[PDB]
Paper text:
The arbitrium system comprises three phage genes: (1) AimP, encoding the peptide that is processed into a 6 aa signaling peptide extracellularly, (2) AimR, encoding the intracellular receptor of AimP that is predicted to be structurally similar to RRNPP regulators, and (3) AimX, encoding a putative long non-coding DNA that functions as the negative regulator of lysogeny. As a transcription factor, AimR dimer induces expression of AimX, which promotes lytic cycle. The concentration of AimP will eventually reach the point that its uptake by newly infected bacteria will be high enough to bind AimR and abolish transcriptional activation of AimX, thereby shifting the phage into lysogenic cycle.
The electron density of the N-terminus of AimR within the AimR-AimP complex was of better quality; using the structure of apo AimR as a model, the binary complex AimR-AimP was solved by molecular replacement and refined to 2.00 Å resolution. In the structure of AimR-AimP complex, two molecules of AimR are present in the asymmetric cell unit. One molecule of the AimP hexapeptide (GMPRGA) binds to one molecule AimR. The C-terminus alanine of AimP is facing the interior of the pocket, whereas the N-terminal glycine is located at the entry point. The oxygen atoms from the peptide backbone of AimR form hydrogen bonds with four AimP residues: Q299AimR and E300AimR interact with the nitrogen moiety of G1AimP, N239AimR forms hydrogen bonds with P3AimP, N202AimR interacts with G5AimP, and R228AimR contacts the oxygen moieties of A6AimP, whereas five hydrophobic residues from AimR (L205, L242, F276, F362 and L363) are involved in van der Waals interactions with the side chain of M2AimP. As opposed to the classical interaction between RRNPP and the signaling peptide in bacteria that does not include side chain-specific contacts, the guanidinium group of R4AimP forms hydrogen bonds with three residues in AimR, namely N206, N329 and D360. However, our structure indicates that in the spBeta-derived AimR-AimP complex AimRs still exist as a dimer.
Residue numbers in the entry:
A (entry chain D): 1 to 6
B (entry chain A): 1 to 390
Write the structure that this text describes.
Amino acid sequence: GMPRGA
Amino acid sequence: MELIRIAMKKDLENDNSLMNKWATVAGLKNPNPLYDFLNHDGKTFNEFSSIVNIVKSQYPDREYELMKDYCLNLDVKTKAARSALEYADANMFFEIEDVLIDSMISCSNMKSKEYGKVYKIHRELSNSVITEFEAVKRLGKLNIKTPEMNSFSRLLLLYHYLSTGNFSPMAQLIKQIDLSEISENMYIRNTYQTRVHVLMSNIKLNENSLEECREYSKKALESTNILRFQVFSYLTIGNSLLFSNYELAQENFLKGLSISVQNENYNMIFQQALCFLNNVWRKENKWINFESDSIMDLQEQAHCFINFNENSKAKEVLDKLDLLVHNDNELAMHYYLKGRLEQNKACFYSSIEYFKKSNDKFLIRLPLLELQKMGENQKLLELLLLLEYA
């Protein structure tokens, strides 16, 4: 998948 | 003495102009708190901003070692210790953070007690030690009084939503935050503000509002000197370009790589971002992790295999993924891959269902495009774009 973060 | 002030004094023995330069870097206006900070044990600056800025300017290569020693020797009842808890959490310095937390949960100052108990809920929820239900319940019983922990009780939910692929509650929750209510601790206010800028970038990305997503990440970058927030800004900017600008998306992920080379976790995240980028554009993919059984990495093995018409090897990998447990956003991606392998429209509708469930308006462009290629009625696609989930 696509990595996502904050 | 703490290692930080030992080094600051031995370095001021050799150069005296460092007094005026350190006072400017810390924002002090005159070295009076600097002199006091070096001459009596236990004296703290008014804003944690002061020590962090000197450490980053004068000893950048030694930040972690210096701040670990300085933070863990602070009076847990103080403002300085409460700022260090945020510094630690914002930097993902978990070993500083968890020591400070069990230390502040134990003390006798009520502000530090509160911070500790709320940051502990965030850490337990972060590690899937507790569910969201037991976190919300525990937060309620705390009767949180400070505006900082009222802001952070909501931030920690936002991070949990982002990480579990459950995006629909985030927009209304983030609107409840008012950081102008934070007036006692300018370092916590400024760092929470960076936190909100990066979370707003992710929410705008998840709404397919790509210009606004990039403006919010750019404001995070101008607002911060903390590596964790720069990493997630470059990550989110790059993600926003995935479907439109290969070279600029790659350039942002490579900039992210360049600033996180000594951090295995952040380095891995940019490899994964470059891995997805190259699969979206159906190019040769040198970023695949063939020694992993995470869903993220396995999905990209399958994607690349499908792109290069190696359908057997993609079937093997997708056989693996069936025997792992997916969340909503991961499942939507799983059905997208199944549809591309199978050439099966039903897989693409299940993909859409779960992007709708997760409220992901960005990655849904993948199954939508495949349906269009297979001749789906344009009016139907418009309708799917328009309807939403409960």
